[PDB]
């Protein structure tokens, strides 16, 4: 439903066009000429581009492909947009699949990333998916499972405080600390304790949280937790 | 000619002082009441405030006297566990949007908190019905993104119920449902302007995150306005309704008549006190 003359004009609108008809051999032999990373109008990027052309019917194997040879040739999956606006690999990490932010590590991106604007990890943002396959896919490449934000704060403690829940039932799984202290001196489990002191006994989120804390044991972790100092 | 906000603030002080002291019931009513709507209209003048952000790394203008916008000041929000990067919604334009203010100690002494105050989207939208020619939010439903401003405002909910220095929740209207989510999942006091209620489906989804409490919520709402007049829950909170609105349910729901009728009420609570001289 998109049309690349909106975005693009030139040597980009000539690229853009091998990435709207998914020729993997012509994107790679224009993409080592063109320039990848100016962007064109309505803040698209040549990198968005190629996400935008591989979604629904166009999620195939060589279309994905060509997310990862435009990386391969120098476009920046890091580069934000305008007024902190995210870039395509914190995008596509809030995904409901995986396959895209694969496309991206398969040219290279580094599962530890800090964004370009905010320095923050750029996995933290899979924590706002509908599930977990991009986080899956980040630990998998190797992502440090504990890597902390500027304040401390672990994918462990993040994604409890968003209750996005089988994130956390993943890290615990896959052997994320769950001792480590944010700034504040809060574990995961100082939080755990005031949700499930909150939570209605019986309900859905009180089996949840209560699942939670039976995994969190399972993996050596203390409980009940120590009190914040 | 004109005067700072800090002698201001000390005479309304004082007037308040004079009610409360005051041998007459409805003095001392009077001053309880306008000592609560000189806070609650600080809190209005702030949620009036973050619809004027445009870029949320830059400066908000036109920061109501006596507060300082510390939205892009890391080492002023780390002191409530905020970051810059989570006071907002990055995928496209930030419709959900926080800022954080501190008030200024030479104005107010210490009868100010910091106070996070949201801003929320002027026309919700159910995403399948977006304009799809709009290349994100084609990219947003191929992708399979979530769509829930109430996820990252019961998010910065879990985070501020730690933090040592007591920050305040305030919003309007949408922004205003936001903020009693986040002030019921952390615990801090919070204020609403034409606030939107929290639907069941999410008070259901955050579970006893956004479950009872409530009573430090102070609900302001012009009579009249759009949604108290219409599967639509009330606002959350202690309801304090507001006369003196003007034209049709639209008009009264815009923050600049939650400031006004708040500004009619205290005017008429200072005349009470007054004639009790």
């Given at each position: 439903?998109?049309?690349?003359?909106?975005?693009?004009?030139?040597?980009?609108?000539?690229?853009?066009?091998?990435?709207?008809?998914?020729?993997?051999?012509?994107?790679?032999?224009?993409?080592?000429?063109?320039?990848?990373?100016?962007?064109?109008?309505?803040?698209?990027?040549?990198?968005?581009?190629?996400?935008?052309?591989?979604?629904?019917?166009?999620?195939?194997?060589?279309?994905?492909?060509?997310?990862?040879?435009?990386?391969?040739?120098?476009?920046?999956?890091?580069?934000?947009?305008?007024?902190?606006?995210?870039?395509?690999?914190?995008?596509?990490?809030?995904?409901?699949?995986?396959?895209?932010?694969?496309?991206?590590?398969?040219?290279?991106?580094?599962?530890?990333?800090?964004?370009?604007?905010?320095?923050?990890?750029?996995?933290?943002?899979?924590?706002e998916?509908?599930?977990?396959?991009?986080?899956?896919?980040?630990?998998?490449?190797?992502?440090?499972?504990?890597?902390?934000?500027?304040?401390?704060?672990?994918?462990?403690?993040?994604?409890?405080?968003?209750?996005?829940?089988?994130?956390?039932?993943?890290?615990?799984?896959?052997?994320?600390?769950?001792?480590?202290?944010?700034?504040?001196?809060?574990?995961?489990?100082?939080?755990?304790?005031?949700?499930?002191?909150?939570?209605?006994?019986?309900?859905?989120?009180?089996?949840?949280?209560?699942?939670?804390?039976?995994?969190?044991?399972?993996?050596?972790?203390?409980?009940?937790?120590?009190?914040?100092? | 000619?004109?005067?700072?906000?800090?002698?201001?603030?000390?005479?309304?002080?004082?007037?308040?002082?004079?009610?409360?002291?005051?041998?007459?019931?409805?003095?001392?009513?009077?001053?309880?009441?306008?000592?609560?709507?000189?806070?609650?209209?600080?809190?209005?003048?702030?949620?009036?405030?973050?619809?004027?952000?445009?870029?949320?790394?830059?400066?908000?203008?036109?920061?109501?006297?006596?507060?300082?916008?510390?939205?892009?000041?890391?080492?002023?929000?780390?002191?409530?566990?905020?970051?810059?990067?989570?006071?907002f919604d990055?995928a496209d334009?930030p419709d959900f949007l926080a800022?954080?203010?501190?008030?200024?100690?030479?104005?107010?002494?210490?009868?100010?908190?910091?106070?996070?105050?949201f801003r929320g989207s002027?026309?919700p939208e159910?995403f399948?019905?977006?304009?799809?020619?709009?290349?994100?939010?084609?990219?947003?439903?191929?992708?399979?993104?979530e769509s829930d401003y109430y996820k990252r405002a019961v998010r910065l909910?879990?985070?501020?119920?730690?933090?040592?220095?007591?920050?305040?929740?305030?919003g309007?209207?949408l922004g205003?449902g936001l903020a009693?989510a986040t002030?019921?999942?952390?615990?801090?006091?919070?204020?609403?302007?034409?606030?939107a209620?929290?639907?069941?489906?999410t008070?259901?989804?955050?579970?006893?995150?956004?479950?009872?409490?409530?009573?430090?919520?102070?609900?302001?709402?012009?009579?009249?306005?759009?949604?108290?007049?219409?599967?639509?829950?009330?606002?959350?909170?202690?309801?304090?309704?507001?006369?003196?609105?003007?034209?049709?349910?639209?008009?009264?729901?815009?923050?600049?008549?939650?400031?006004?009728?708040?500004?009619?009420?205290?005017?008429?609570?200072?005349?009470?006190?007054?004639?009790?001289?």
């Amino acid at each position: 439903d998109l049309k690349p003359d909106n975005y693009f004009s030139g040597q980009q609108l000539t690229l853009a066009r091998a990435i709207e008809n998914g020729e993997v051999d012509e994107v790679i032999k224009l993409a080592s000429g063109t320039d990848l990373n100016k962007p064109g109008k309505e803040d698209m990027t040549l990198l968005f581009w190629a996400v935008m052309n591989s979604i629904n019917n166009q999620k195939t194997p060589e279309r994905l492909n060509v997310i990862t040879m435009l990386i391969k040739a120098g476009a920046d999956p890091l580069q934000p947009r305008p007024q902190g606006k995210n870039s395509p690999a914190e995008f596509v990490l809030m995904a409901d699949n995986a396959d895209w932010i694969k496309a991206m590590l398969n040219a290279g991106l580094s599962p530890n990333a800090v964004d370009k604007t905010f320095g923050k990890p750029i996995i933290f943002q899979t924590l706002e998916a509908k599930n977990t396959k991009t986080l899956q896919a980040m630990l998998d490449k190797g992502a440090d499972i504990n890597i902390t934000d500027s304040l401390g704060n672990t994918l462990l403690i993040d994604a409890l405080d968003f209750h996005s829940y089988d994130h956390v039932l993943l890290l615990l799984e896959r052997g994320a600390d769950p001792e480590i202290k944010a700034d504040n001196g809060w574990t995961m489990g100082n939080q755990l304790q005031r949700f499930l002191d909150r939570a209605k006994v019986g309900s859905d989120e009180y089996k949840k949280l209560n699942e939670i804390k039976d995994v969190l044991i399972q993996h050596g972790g203390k409980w009940p937790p120590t009190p914040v100092k | 000619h004109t005067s700072t906000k800090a002698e201001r603030w000390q005479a309304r002080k004082d007037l308040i002082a004079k009610g409360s002291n005051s041998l007459y019931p409805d003095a001392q009513i009077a001053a309880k009441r306008l000592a609560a709507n000189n806070i609650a209209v600080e809190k209005a003048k702030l949620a009036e405030n973050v619809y004027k952000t445009v870029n949320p790394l830059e400066a908000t203008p036109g920061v109501p006297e006596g507060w300082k916008d510390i939205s892009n000041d890391a080492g002023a929000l780390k002191k409530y566990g905020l970051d810059k990067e989570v006071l907002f919604d990055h995928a496209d334009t930030p419709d959900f949007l926080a800022r954080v203010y501190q008030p200024d100690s030479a104005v107010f002494g210490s009868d100010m908190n910091p106070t996070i105050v949201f801003r929320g989207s002027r026309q919700p939208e159910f995403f399948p019905t977006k304009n799809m020619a709009d290349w994100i939010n084609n990219g947003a439903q191929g992708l399979g993104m979530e769509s829930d401003y109430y996820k990252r405002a019961v998010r910065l909910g879990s985070r501020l119920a730690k933090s040592v220095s007591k920050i305040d929740i305030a919003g309007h209207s949408l922004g205003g449902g936001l903020a009693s989510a986040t002030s019921i999942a952390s615990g801090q006091a919070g204020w609403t302007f034409n606030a939107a209620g929290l639907h069941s489906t999410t008070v259901e989804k955050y579970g006893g995150s956004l479950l009872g409490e409530a009573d430090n919520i102070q609900a302001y709402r012009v009579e009249g306005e759009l949604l108290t007049k219409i599967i639509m829950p009330n606002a959350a909170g202690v309801v304090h309704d507001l006369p003196g609105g003007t034209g049709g349910p639209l008009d009264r729901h815009g923050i600049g008549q939650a400031i006004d009728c708040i500004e009619q009420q205290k005017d008429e609570d200072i005349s009470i006190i007054r004639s009790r001289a």
